[PDB]
């Protein structure tokens, strides 16, 4: 299978309460391995996965320096954009940045991406061709022209096919015991009578990795998406994920419904019947 | 690892 490394950054302007809050998190495919909090006491890049703690002090110094650089740039951009939209100085605003790169099973570079948002709306993104930028509003056209004049797309592309992919290969080779595993989901089913007429028949799948899983309901061959209420895949906390999908069924015909679970850790898509 | 720098918006 393919793999991916991503970095998430959130800067929140809290005027009057000091300098903006800045939080940075690093993920390898689903696993958080580095983090940084602008309010943390260490003020350093901290490990969060057991397979990243084995890096030398030079690595941690470099990552700390780069994180603080990102924080400085984002703290400047907060005021820049607050002035762009003529927004009040007392309002709290949020900049969110995500960038990363994907690799294949043999370790070859597949694609890369960067996306920046302001207050939860898309601000500026890197196109699929890794050579142009897509801007949402007129304020983002300024940043688009600014980054085009600064050859930023080329430098980012040189970062993606190089440093990014190489460090992702290193991370996959170092934490191969837990990052290349495929935990199959353990499935079961519960039945809760809502009233004397209808009942909720819930289909559970627990302890699977990664989080990509498909839960479907069938009434004798056809998928009925009129009552299927899926739920955000939640982290168990130990490294696995959980997900349930329920359906409201008239009491007396629970035997006509089937739950189908599709996951990469299962040879055949399982079928559950109450 | 991370990137080295980026241009202000």
């Amino acid at each position: 299978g393919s793999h991916s490394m991503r970095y998430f950054f959130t800067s929140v302007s809290r005027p009057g309460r000091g300098e903006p809050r800045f939080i940075a998190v690093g993920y390898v495919d689903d696993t958080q391995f580095v983090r940084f909090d602008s309010d943390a006491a260490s003020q350093r890049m901290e490990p969060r996965a057991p397979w990243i703690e084995q890096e030398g002090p030079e690595y941690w110094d470099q990552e700390t320096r780069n994180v603080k650089a990102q924080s400085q740039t984002d703290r400047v951009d907060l005021g820049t954009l607050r002035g762009y939209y003529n927004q009040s100085e007392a309002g709290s605003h949020t900049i969110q940045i995500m960038y990363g790169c994907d690799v294949g099973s043999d370790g070859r570079f597949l694609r890369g991406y960067r996306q920046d948002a302001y207050d939860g709306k898309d601000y500026i993104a890197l196109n699929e061709d890794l050579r142009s930028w897509t801007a949402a509003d007129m304020a983002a056209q300024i940043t688009k022209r600014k980054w085009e004049a600064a050859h930023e797309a080329e430098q980012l592309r040189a970062y993606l096919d190089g440093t990014c992919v190489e460090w992702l290969r290193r991370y996959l080779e170092n934490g191969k015991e837990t990052l290349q595993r495929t935990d199959p989901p353990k499935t079961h089913m519960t039945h809760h009578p809502i009233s004397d007429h209808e009942a909720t028949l819930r289909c559970w799948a627990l302890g699977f990795y990664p989080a990509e899983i498909t839960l479907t309901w069938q009434r004798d061959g056809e998928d009925q998406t009129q009552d299927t209420e899926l739920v955000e895949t939640r982290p168990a906390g130990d490294g696995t994920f959980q997900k349930w999908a329920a359906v409201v069924v008239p009491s007396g015909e629970e035997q006509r419904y089937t739950c189908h679970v599709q996951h990469e850790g299962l040879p055949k898509p399982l079928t559950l019947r109450w | 690892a991370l990137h080295g720098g980026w241009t202000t918006k």
Partner: T-cell receptor
Amino acid sequence: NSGPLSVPEGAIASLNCTYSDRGSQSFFWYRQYSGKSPELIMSIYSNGDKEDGRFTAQLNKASQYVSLLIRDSQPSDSATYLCAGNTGTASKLTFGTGTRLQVTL
Amino acid sequence: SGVTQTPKHLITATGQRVTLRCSPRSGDLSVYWYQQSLDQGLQFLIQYYNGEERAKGNILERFSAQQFPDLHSELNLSSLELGDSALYFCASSGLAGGPVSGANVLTFGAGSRLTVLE
């Protein structure tokens, strides 16, 4: 690599640079006349070749090879040429051992 | 040029302290301090970004540096030795927020030559 080269006027000068740090991503050719300050003349980001005017930069990151090719050398090209590397827009530039080019008339 | 270093020439004795002032180009945020001796090439000393410290290289503890909120920087050298006689350069990169135009390059200053004598 330290010079000089002694390339006659009208010929093709070729400089190369020894860069220590293996972590850089973008490379730059600066020109510095004696006493003056280094001024940028070439920027290269992708592995391979790039050309601008009379200058042609070349990069192979896997072997840390950076090279410059000055076509039709003129007496106004006699200076020290330095290579630099960085990892971003405002990252630190680290310079390698530059080379002295002298164009004879 | 846009970058202004002061002074341009300075002659002091051993064990003294000197200060080098540098105002960057109008529109740049980051300020880099480099040292160039005859033996080696350009050695990276330090780099500040918008008042905060951005990068630090092989720099002695006798060397202090600062960037003021008006984006201009100062580099203070103490307990000067004969080997400290070199050419100290100040460059400015980084582009301030907004529609400010300019090339994404390092613009070096005229330099400041310091000679330490016994």
